Design a protein around this nucleic acid. Structure first.
Ligand SMILES: Nc1ncnc2c1ncn2[C@H]1C[C@H](O)[C@@H](COP(=O)(O)OP(=O)(O)OP(=O)(O)O)O1
Ligand SMILES: [Ca+2]
Ligand SMILES: [Ca+2]
Ligand SMILES: [Ca+2]
Length: 341
DNA sequence: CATGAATCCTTCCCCC
DNA sequence: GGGGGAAGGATTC
């Protein structure tokens, strides 16, 4: 089997260059302003020019300005990136339609039925890198190997504007050499639990006996890692259906007064219904972020679908529920609809 | 100073 | 005991 993985580069920023190419050559930061104070918020992505000087995702806008005060700071326009992505996805559809859309930025492709070997795949790689570049002026990175995981790894190695192959062999070394934290699905929290078990490398998994492993990470995380290191990981590609929709918004100031908060919440809902389009949810959660960045949620599943009118009233019941249980102030509030039909 | 969602986990609860 | 399913939270990207 041959999987081809595609990650678009500094994607929001890149789209921003493509739309105003005067930007090409300057450091660019797409960021998301909360508006509690002037230039509050966080960086979403930045082009490589900016990333050189340590300006990347997650970091606060304030601290990006301490480094690169003469850079360009644009508000995120997600909906645009969304359409552009969609276009790009349709180019790939007609290169193979055994296709998994991971994120806005990433997709996998079975091309067993189109290529025979890693040579002629690479070719498919470049045809695509190119097709996309010509059609949309977008640089991407392409990774290829025998399954989804190693494809994704291939790309991470090759970033940016790269293309890389990890043949049925070189897996070998990675299973021995490659750091466990650079494995997809292993964030800091999980990585540190494994370092704490003397597993800094994908092969160490077999030394330990499963049941201790399972207890500390989880059955599926364990199985996942074991199959990788053992080499039987061969999860397929498929199309993936959206199961959940919802927005979550930041308030002017932390609060526990219901009347101050409800408006913010009614924005989240209406946006969510606009976004729902034709589909109808049976479940609704309300979600609050505390002043010290903790998340609580309360929800409810209905035996039937949910009208706009219902959602409005039911959400108030849940925020009321959140308020008398958790005593902290609320920083951000919002909703999430689940369980369509 | 810190801005959408899938998947997994753990804890209940109902019940046969 | 174990199936079936909900809630709330944990974790990843
Ligand atoms: N930590 C984050 N905070 C906010 N937005 C993010 C974050 N990670 C990713 N995104 C959004 C913005 C990105 O343009 C897009 C895809 O992310 P990702 O592939 O991780 O990096 P990137 O597309 O910015 O550049 P690159 O892939 O070259 O690092 O999703
Ligand atoms: Ca990317
Ligand atoms: Ca990691
Ligand atoms: Ca990503």
């Amino acid at each position: 089997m041959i999987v081809l993985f595609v990650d678009f580069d500094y994607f929001y920023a890149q789209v921003e260059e493509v739309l105003n190419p005067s930007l090409k050559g300057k450091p660019v930061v797409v960021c998301v302003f909360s508006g509690r104070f002037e230039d509050s918020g966080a960086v979403a992505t930045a082009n490589y020019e900016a990333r050189k000087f340590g300006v990347k995702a997650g970091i606060p806008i304030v601290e990006a300005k301490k480094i690169l005060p003469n850079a360009v700071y644009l508000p995120m326009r997600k909906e645009v990136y969304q359409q552009v992505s969609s276009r790009i996805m349709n180019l790939l559809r007609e290169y193979s339609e055994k296709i998994e859309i991971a994120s806005i930025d990433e997709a996998y492709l079975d091309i067993s039925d189109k290529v025979r070997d890693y040579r002629e795949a690479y070719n498919l790689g470049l045809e695509i890198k190119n097709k996309i570049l010509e059609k949309e002026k977008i640089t991407v990175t392409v990774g290829i190997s025998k399954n989804k995981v190693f494809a994704k790894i291939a790309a991470d190695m090759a970033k940016p504007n790269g293309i890389k192959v990890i043949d049925d062999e070189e897996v070998k070394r990675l299973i021995r050499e490659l750091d466990i934290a650079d494995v997809p699905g292993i964030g800091n929290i999980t990585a540190e639990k494994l370092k704490k078990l003397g597993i800094n490398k994908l092969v160490d998994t077999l030394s330990i006996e499963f049941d201790k492993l399972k207890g500390m990470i989880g059955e599926a995380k364990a199985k996942y890692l074991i199959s990788l290191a053992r080499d039987e990981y061969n999860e397929p590609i498929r199309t993936r259906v959206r199961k959940s929709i919802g927005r979550i918004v930041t308030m002017k100031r932390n609060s526990r007064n219901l009347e101050e908060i409800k408006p913010y919440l009614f924005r989240a809902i209406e946006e969510s219904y606009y976004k729902l389009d034709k589909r109808i949810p049976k479940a609704i959660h309300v979600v609050a972020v505390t002043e010290d960045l903790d998340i609580v949620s309360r929800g409810r599943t209905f035996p039937h679908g949910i009208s706009k009118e219902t959602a409005y009233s039911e959400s108030v019941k849940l925020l009321q529920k959140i308020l008398e249980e958790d005593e902290r102030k609320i920083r951000r509030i919002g909703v999430r609809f689940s369980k369509f039909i």
